[PDB]
Design a protein around this ligand. Structure first.
Ligand SMILES: O=c1[nH]c(N2CCCC2)cc2ccccc12
Lengths: 256, 243
């Protein structure tokens, strides 16, 4: 007995490589004054939470704090051009503000398509047919701060980043969809990342990953702020979403 | 308590309504090409959704006002006895817009009609939009159109399903129908009644993206790959087990 090359309704990505793969985390807390963007207190909690969860799944995690755009591009270009032949998959997380198709680095914005395009096709042959998962916590920075050089609070940011797709075997995960609001607690971190990390810890090692993202959708969409603490946060619901171009089931069973 | 495997309750008296808006021809002033093969798509979809328990309603070449009127009428009736709601658009599109016969309509206007405040009886139920719409180029022939419609998200418990993502190309056979719709219907027929629906959509991703573009009867279409996508805001597992 063997498996003939017949359409399998339950096909899974092969997750038996020597290594799980790299998980990149781009963490942005502060921005060049000329961008007139507010700080993102709580993002370091998000970064740490993610590092622990992804590391327990076998990923090699690399974090970068407050990179300038050129440095960021350089770093991601460097990761895209090495061999991922011995890896199962690739994860890239952006924790920043954003606008439309753009994510903000420290000093400038970068087009998302530019970042994902580095891992397409034969630009990165050794990731072809492997899951390429981008996780994006980025929304509109509230701008009631000046264009001049300069306790757990929940900050509420309007969705601003387009929920773009990205190519075969890409999975694009967004903290929030158009019309909704992203929330970040200044000590505990983002609603989305907290709930993502909690599900990863509890179910990451067995649950099909888009099914886990669906759990995150439910958890986040059911959260309520105070109403005593911020009353105008009243009514600003958060609905995450994910755009999948995956072609197989994705699991993170513990590597043998 | 929290259930990691919770499913939408698909227990209601009826499965629900599946609306199909089918556009084959457009008013001359729009200068859009005909969509031969779309009638096969309409028929294929009707059979699949009907076998899944859906009350299917098809409308061919409605003008924008008629289309808006019809979908508003559907959004304002009670879906209290229904499991869910499906809406399919077969047309050309651009950005945020899908073409009716005479004019374009914003997708957000269409999905907004079924958001919780506007449609109480669908709150907490899957609302599934399937969109075969790309850029109209201005015996079985394969037509190849550039992706043009933004892969928009919609609200909680919406699932937005797109024939093609930015950078890729949608294909339609004049006799057999669209690649995306053909593969979707094929999967619906074999696995619709058992497989979790986003897992089924993943199969469709695989099926469409593996269709070779190496040797086209039209050398111009060589290398113009199709990759679909879906944007999920579902909050539970979705199955269409026989009612
Ligand atoms: O490219 C996109 N543009 C836009 N917009 C440009 C016009 C305003 C929205 C929205 C979107 C959403 C999901 C996926 C892609 C897109």
């Amino acid at each position: 007995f063997y498996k003939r090359e017949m359409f399998d309704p339950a096909e899974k990505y092969k997750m038996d490589h020597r290594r799980r793969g790299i998980a990149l985390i781009f963490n942005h807390e502060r921005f060049f004054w000329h961008l007139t963007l507010p700080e993102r207190r709580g993002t370091c909690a998000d970064r740490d939470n993610l590092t622990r969860r992804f590391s327990d799944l076998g990923f090699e995690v690399k974090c970068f704090n407050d990179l300038k755009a050129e440095e960021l591009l350089l770093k991601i270009h460097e990761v895209s051009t090495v061999s991922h032949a011995d890896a199962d998959c690739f994860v890239c997380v952006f924790l920043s503000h954003g606008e439309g198709n753009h994510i903000y680095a420290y000093d400038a914005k970068i087009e998302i398509q530019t970042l994902t395009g580095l891992f397409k096709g034969d630009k990165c042959h050794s990731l072809v047919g492997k899951p390429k998962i981008f996780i994006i916590q980025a929304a509109r920075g509230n701008q009631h701060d000046v264009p001049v050089i300069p306790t757990n609070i929940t900050e509420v940011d309007a969705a601003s980043v387009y929920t773009l797709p990205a190519g075969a075997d890409f999975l694009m995960c967004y903290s929030v969809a158009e019309g909704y609001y992203s929330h970040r607690e200044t000590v505990n971190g983002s609603w989305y990342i907290q709930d993502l990390c909690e599900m990863l810890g509890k179910y990451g090692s067995s649950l099909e990953f888009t099914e886990l993202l669906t759990l995150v959708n439910r958890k986040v969409s059911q959260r309520r702020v105070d109403f005593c603490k911020d009353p105008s946060a009243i009514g600003k619901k958060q609905v995450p979403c994910f755009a999948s171009m995956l072609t197989k089931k994705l699991h993170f069973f513990p590597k043998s």
